[PDB]
UniProtKB/Swiss-Prot annotation, chain A:
Source species: Homo sapiens (Human)
Residues that, per the record, bind Mg(2+): 93
Entry annotated with the keyword Phosphoprotein: yes
Gene: CCT5
Induction record: Down-regulated in response to enterovirus 71 (EV71) infection (at protein level).
Name of this protein: T-complex protein 1 subunit epsilon
Highest taxon, organism lineage: Eukaryota
Keywords in alphabetical order: Acetylation, ATP-binding, Chaperone, Cytoplasm, Cytoskeleton, Disease variant, Hydrolase, Isopeptide bond, Neuropathy, Nucleotide-binding, Phosphoprotein, Ubl conjugation
Swiss-Prot record, chain B:
Organism the protein comes from: Homo sapiens (Human)
Phenotypic consequence of residue 378 to K: Found in a patient with developmental delay, intellectual disability, pyramidal and cerebellar signs, cerebellar vermis hypoplasia and hypoplasia of the corpus callosum; uncertain significance
Protein known as: T-complex protein 1 subunit eta
Gene Ontology terms, MF aspect: ATP binding; ATP hydrolysis activity; ATP-dependent protein folding chaperone; identical protein binding; protein folding chaperone; unfolded protein binding
Subcellular location: Cytoplasm
Phylogenetic lineage: Eukaryota, Metazoa, Chordata, Craniata, Vertebrata
Gene this protein is translated from: CCT7
From Swiss-Prot, chain C:
Primary localization class, coarse: cytoplasm
Phosphoserine carried by residues: 2, 487
Residues that coordinate or bind ATP: 33, 85-87
This protein's name: T-complex protein 1 subunit alpha
Phenotype for residue 3 to L: In a breast cancer sample; somatic mutation
Subcellular location: Cytoplasm, Cytosol; Cytoplasm, Cytoskeleton, Microtubule organizing center, Centrosome
Binding of ADP, residues: 33, 85-88, 154-155, 408, 501
InterPro entries listed in its UniProt record: Chap_CCT_alpha, Chaperone_TCP-1, Chaperonin_TCP-1_CS, Cpn60/GroEL/TCP-1, GroEL-like_apical_dom_sf, GROEL-like_equatorial_sf, TCP-1-like_intermed_sf, TCP-1_chaperonin
Swiss-Prot/TrEMBL keywords: Acetylation, ATP-binding, Chaperone, Cytoplasm, Cytoskeleton, Disease variant, Epilepsy, Hydrolase, Intellectual disability, Nucleotide-binding, Phosphoprotein
EC code(s) of this entry: 3.6.1.-
Name of the gene encoding the protein in the UniProt record: TCP1
Amino acid sequence: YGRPFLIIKDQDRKSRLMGLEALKSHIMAAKAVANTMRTSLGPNGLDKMMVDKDGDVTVTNDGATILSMMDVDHQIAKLMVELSKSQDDEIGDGTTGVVVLAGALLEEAEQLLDRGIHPIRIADGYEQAARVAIEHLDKISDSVLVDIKDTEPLIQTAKTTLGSKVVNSCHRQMAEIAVNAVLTVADMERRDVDFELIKVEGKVGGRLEDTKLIKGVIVDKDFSHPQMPKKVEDAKIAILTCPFEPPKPKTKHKLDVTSVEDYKALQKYEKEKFEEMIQQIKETGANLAICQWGFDDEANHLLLQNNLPAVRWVGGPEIELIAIATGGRIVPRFSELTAEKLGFAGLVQEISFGTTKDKMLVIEQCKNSRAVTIFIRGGNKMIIEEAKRSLHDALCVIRNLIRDNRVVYGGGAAEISCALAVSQEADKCPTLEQYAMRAFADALEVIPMALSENSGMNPIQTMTEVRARQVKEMNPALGIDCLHKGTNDMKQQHVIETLIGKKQQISLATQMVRMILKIDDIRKPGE
Amino acid sequence: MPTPVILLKEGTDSSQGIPQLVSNISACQVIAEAVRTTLGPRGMDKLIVDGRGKATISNDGATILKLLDVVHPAAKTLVDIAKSQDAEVGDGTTSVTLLAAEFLKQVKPYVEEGLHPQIIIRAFRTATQLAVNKIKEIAVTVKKADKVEQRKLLEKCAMTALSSKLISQQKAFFAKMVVDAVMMLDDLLQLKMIGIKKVQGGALEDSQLVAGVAFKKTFSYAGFEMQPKKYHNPKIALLNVELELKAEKDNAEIRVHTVEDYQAIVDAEWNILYDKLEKIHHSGAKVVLSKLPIGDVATQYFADRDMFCAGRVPEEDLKRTMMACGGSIQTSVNALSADVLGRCQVFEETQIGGERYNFFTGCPKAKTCTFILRGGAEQFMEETERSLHDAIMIVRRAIKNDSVVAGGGAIEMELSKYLRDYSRTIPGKQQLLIGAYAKALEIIPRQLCDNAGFDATNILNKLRARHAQGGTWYGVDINNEDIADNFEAFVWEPAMVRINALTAASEAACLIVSVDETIKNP
Amino acid sequence: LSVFGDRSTGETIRSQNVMAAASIANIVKSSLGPVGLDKMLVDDIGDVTITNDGATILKLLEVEHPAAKVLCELADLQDKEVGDGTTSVVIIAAELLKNADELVKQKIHPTSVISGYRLACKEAVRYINENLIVNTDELGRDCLINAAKTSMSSKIIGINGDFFANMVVDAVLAIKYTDIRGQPRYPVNSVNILKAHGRSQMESMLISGYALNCVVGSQGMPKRIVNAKIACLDFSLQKTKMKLGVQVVITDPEKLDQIRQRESDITKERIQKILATGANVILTTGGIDDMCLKYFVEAGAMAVRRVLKRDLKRIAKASGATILSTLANLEGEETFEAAMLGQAEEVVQERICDDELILIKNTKARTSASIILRGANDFMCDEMERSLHDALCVVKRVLESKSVVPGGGAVEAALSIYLENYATSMGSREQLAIAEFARSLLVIPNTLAVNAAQDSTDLVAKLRAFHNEAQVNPERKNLKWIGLDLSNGKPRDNKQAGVFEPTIVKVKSLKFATEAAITILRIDDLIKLHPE
C-alpha cells in the first residue's frame, strides 16, 4: 500500500530526467557548446583563452585544446570534449568546426523532434545522408596523387590550414618549415610518419619569424665542462650510456679491501680505469662525445685534456634523435665502441640564444637525417605554445595527405555541394526519411553560415549567391570569400583541404550525434 | 526502574504479509520501468554516471542494472537474473527482466485475493515446463535443410541480435566480421582468446578485424624508434624472462679481493646479458616480445643488428600472440629452438589515432583474432565492446546449438496462443493462473510497438487473429509497422536465449512470491 | 520553469495518483461487509475514536496528496447522501481508477476510457432499474427490519441487529411528516440521539417523544409534571438592559429606587403574564436568571435554560407549541396566549448515569421519537450513534424511494457479466474500458471474502457462474436468482436471507465513483509550489 520505500540508496538525491524533456535539455547543452565554439572557426574567426586550475593561462584556437582545458560537468559536454580530442588526434584541425557540425545538426534534430518524429528514424536518416555526402564528396574530390614531387600543393595545403592560427604572421615560412620537415621524415614506401622523429621545440625570445627548422637535433644542455671550445667543425660523434665512472655491477655488490697493497692497487685502478677509457675514446677516432648520465669530474678534466668536448645528462629521446641524425649507434661500453658506430654531422655549435640565460646546443648535421627538429622563437610563452600546437596540427594534416593523396578545395564549397546533392536525393527519398534528408542538409549548411558570420558579411545573402552559382555552374569550387577577394574560386584561391579531413569529420559527427539522439533517460546523482 | 525486554535489535524493521508481497511486486515493476524502454530494433539505451563522475552509457539492460546499485532486496534478485542471462545468452536480459516484472504484474491482482502463493508457483512451474517443451518442439534446425551455409544462420543470428545496440546501422558489416572471427575461435570457444581493442578516434565504420594480434601498448626505451619497423616474413621469439642487468633477479651479496676480479665480475654480468642476446640473435628470429621489461642495451643491439623488440607487453596479448603464430612462450633463453618460434605472414607497426600500435597477421593457422575498434567516443568504446561481447557469445552459443527460432516476439505470441488454448483443458484455479501467464507473456511485442510508437492494440489484435491459424512466425515488423513473417524476414535468435529467459523468469516469480516478510538489521 | 517547486508529468504522475488511491483504499479495505472490522485512531493526545464508517475515518485522517483529498471529499458527500457505502464507494472509486490506469498504463487514450466509463455507468443504472425489487407488495416492517439489520452488521451493533432494527423502524415510522403537499417526507436527524455510558445497548431505550440533554435550573423547583402545559421561549429572561445605548441620567434623585424597582418588575410582570396562562413548563435557549427561578419555584412550574435551538424547534413541532422569540401582538401591548402552548403527557428529568436528563413523553400534537444509548465507554457509545444515524439514513431512503436492492454484492455480481456481454456491442476500443470496469467492479466480493478470510477466487467464480446461468435460458423465473453470503462462506439467496440495501446507495455510489474516475484519470501533470 501507500508508504515510501528505498529502491536506490540516496533515493532523495538521485535525480532523473526522462524522454522528450531530457532530449531537449541535451540539445540545449549541445547548442551551448556550439555557440561557445562558433567564433573559433575560419580565418576571420576568433580564438579563446583558457585559465588553468592552477592559475595558468593559455590562448589558443584549436578546439580540441579548447574543450580539453574546459572543466565541464554536464555529461554530453564531456562527450563533445572527447569528440574533439578524438577528431584532432586522428586528423588535426577541423576540430575548428567538428563540434560546430554536431551542434547545428542536433539543433535541427530538435526542430524535427518538436514535430514528434521518433529519434531512431532520425538517426537512420542521418546515417543515410552521411553516406550520400561522403560518396558525393569523394566523387568531386581533386587528387594530388597525379602531382609532381609535391612541393607546393603541400605548401598550399599548409598555407590553408594555418590561416586559422595566430602564427599566420609569417605563415608562409612555417608552411615551408612544415612541408620540408615532413617530406624529410616521411616513409613514402609506407605512407606513414612517426612524429616522434619530429622534435618540436620552442624557446621564448626573439621574433616569431626567427623560428627555423634545423636539419638536426637541439639539446637542452650546454657543454659538460665550461672551458671546452664552443664551436666544432668536424662532428665525429660518440654516443654513450655508461657514465664515465668506475663500473659498478648493479647487483648488490661491494669490495673488501684488506691490506696496504690492496688499497694501493685500488687507488691505482681508480685512475688507471679513467686513463683506459680516455685512451679508448681517443683511439676510436671520435672527436665529440655524448653521455646519457653524469660524469665524474676527474674524467671530465681528462676528457678536456684531449680536445674532446662532450655533453652531460642528456635525456633518452634526445639521445636517440642524436643517434639517428648522425647515423651513429648507442654504445654501452667504451670497449665495444669503434669508429664505425661513431656519429657524424656537419656542424655542432652551442648557441647563447638567451641574452642573459643559460645556453642551448644545436647539431647542424649535413647528410640525410631521418629525424629533424623545429626551433620556435617569439615574444610570448603563450605564443610559443600556440605555435607548438599550430605547427603540430600542420604536420598532422600533411601526414594525413601522405596517407591519402586526394584533397578538396576548402572555403565551404565542398559541404555546399554535399548539401545540394543531399537535397537532390531528398526528392527520391520517399517517406519520413525525406524530412531527415532535408534536415541534415540544412543542418550541414551551417559551416558556410558561420564562416560568413565571422566574415562580418550578411551570411545568407552570401550563401544564397553561392548556392545559385554552384547550381548554374557545375564547379564545386565556390565557397565564401573569407579574405574578401572577388573570386569565389577557392581553387584559384588555393583554399584546399584533405578529403580525409572532411570525410572523417562528417562521419564521426554523424555517429556521435546518432548516439546523442539514441539516448533518452539520465539519472544524475546529486553532488 | 525495569523495562520490557525487546525481541530483536532496536529498529529491527519487520513487515509481514500481503502488504509486504505487493510492495515487492511494485518494486519489481519500478525496476522494470528503468529498463522498459530499452529493448527494440527501435529500442533504447540509458546513461548512468557514478558518484565518482565517470559517465557510462549502456543499452544492454544487465549492465545498466549493475550500475543501478539496488538496495531493495527483492529487486536484487531481478538484477541477479540479469547477471545470469548476461553470462548465459546475451540480449534479452532486458527481455528477461520485462518477462519477470510482467509475470508479477499480472499475478498481483490475484494476490490481492488471499491465495496461498504455492498454488501460484505450482501453476508457474507447470506452465514454464510446458512452454519450454513447446519451444523445443517448434525449434528450427538448418543442417537438416539444404539452403544453409554453416555460417548463414550465424550471420543472420548476429544480424538479429545486433540491431538493438549502438551500432545498429552497421550490422551488415559487423555481422560479417564477427562471424568470420568466431569461425577462427575453434575449438577452444572461449572469449579470452579474441581480445577487443578500444582504439580512440576514427569512425567505427573504419574499425578493423585483423587475422592476427595487435597491441595498443608499447614502451619507449632508447632505441625503440631506431630499429626498422617492417619485417616482411619474420620469426617471432617470445620471452617471458626479462632482459636487464640482474635488475630483479636473485638477490646476492658478492665479495672480491682482487680488483681485477671485481672488473671480471662486472664484465661477467654484462656477459650474462650478452649471452642471452646472442642466444636470441643466433636463434634467427627478428621480433622479440617480453612480459618483463627490456634492457635498453639489448634494444640497442637489436637495433644495430636490425631486430625488432618490445618490452612490458601485457600477458593476455602475449598469450594471444603465441596462440596465433603457434610459438610457445619461453623463459629459458638457452633451451631455445626453432620449434617454439612463432612465424607470421607479415609484421608491422602503424599509427592509428596518435597511438603507436604493433601488427602481425596473415598467419594461415591462427585460431585467434582481434578487433581494432575505431570510434570517436570513449563511451562508444565500452558500449560497442559490450554489444560486440553479446554478439560473440551469442554466436558461440549458436555454433554450439544448431537451433534457431523466429524473433520479433513471435515466439512469445506463439507461446501465448498455445498456453491459452491449453488453459481451457485444466479446470479450476489453475486456469486463471495460466491465462495470466499468457497475458503477461504477451508483453514483448507491446513494448516493441510502444518504443515504435504504434497502436500496439491493433497490432496485437491482428497478431492474435492472424496467428490463430495463418502461420507460426508472424510477428512485429518495425519498418512496415505491422505483422510480418519475421522468420523469412530473417529475424533469427537462438532458442537458448528465450528458453533460459523463460526459465529464469519463472523461478524469479517463484522466489519473489514465496516471500511473506522481511527482516532488516542495522 | 516555476520557482519554489518542481513538476511531474505523464507516467510518473499517473502512477503516483494510482499509488495514492490504492493507499487510501487499503486504509479502509478492512471495514466493509458483515465481517468488517472497525478502525480506531489514537488522535495525537489520547482522545481516541473507534469507528468503521469510512467517511468518518477519512474526515478524521489528515490528507495531503490531491487525489486522496478528492476521494475523501467524495466519501464525505456520499455520507451526506446515503450514510453507508462509505464502506464501499471509496473502494469502488479506487479499483476503477486502478484498472482504468492499467489500461492507460499501456497506451490507451484517456478520453476513450472516459467515454467507455460514462457508457458503463449509464448502462449499469439502466440495468439496475431493470433489476429493481419493489417493497410495496412486501411487508413494510419486514423489509424495514431487513434493510436495517443488513446495515447493522459490519458495525458494532450487528449482533443486537434484531432489537436495534425494531427500535429504528419504530422511531422512523413515528417521525412521519407531511411534506410539500403530496410527499410523506421523513426528516432524518429529526429523531434525537443521546449517548449515555453505563448499561448495555440491551437496556438502551426508545422514547415515544423527545429527550433533552439539559437539567432543571433550580433544585427547589419540582421534578415531574403530569400535565402538558409546555411553553417555549427564545426570549431570554433577565432584568432587562437598555439594550442599545440608553443612558439613564438623574436630576431628581427621588426616583432611582423606583427605577431599579421596575428594572426587575418588567421581568416580573412578563413572568406573571406567562404563568397566568397556566403554563407549567418553560424552555429557553437564552439565559435564565435567579430572579425568574425563584418566581417559578413559588409558582412550581418547570424551567430549563440554555437549550439548543434545534431541540426547542423540534419541541415546538412535537408538542405543537409555538416558538416565541418575544412577547408581542398585532397590537403593541406584550401579551401571551394559551394557544401558543404545546402539550405532552408527562415531562420528567431522570437520572441516567448520575446525570439528570429531561424527558418529554407523548406530545399529542405530533408524535416524536428520541433514542437513548447505553454502553460501556464514550467510545462505543458515540461510534454506535454514528451507526444509528446511518441506520436512520438508509431507512429514510427506503421509505422515500419504495425500491430495494438485494444486498451482499449481488449488484456487481450481475453487473460484471451483463456489462461483459454488452461490451461486444460497441465494437470500438471502448469495450475494453467496459470490461475493465466490470472486472474492477468485481472487487466488492473479493474484499468481502478476504475480510471473511476464505478462498476468494472460488467464491467469486461460483457467484459469476450462478449469474451467468441466470443469463442463459431466458425462462429465468426459475433461473434468475440473486444472492451472496459470508458467514457460511458460500452463496445463498439474499432476497430470502433478507440481506437488502437501498437502491439509491448503489446508484449514487456508482455515479459518484464514475465522476471521481473521470476527474482523476484526466490528470497528467502536477506542478508543486513551496509556500510563501
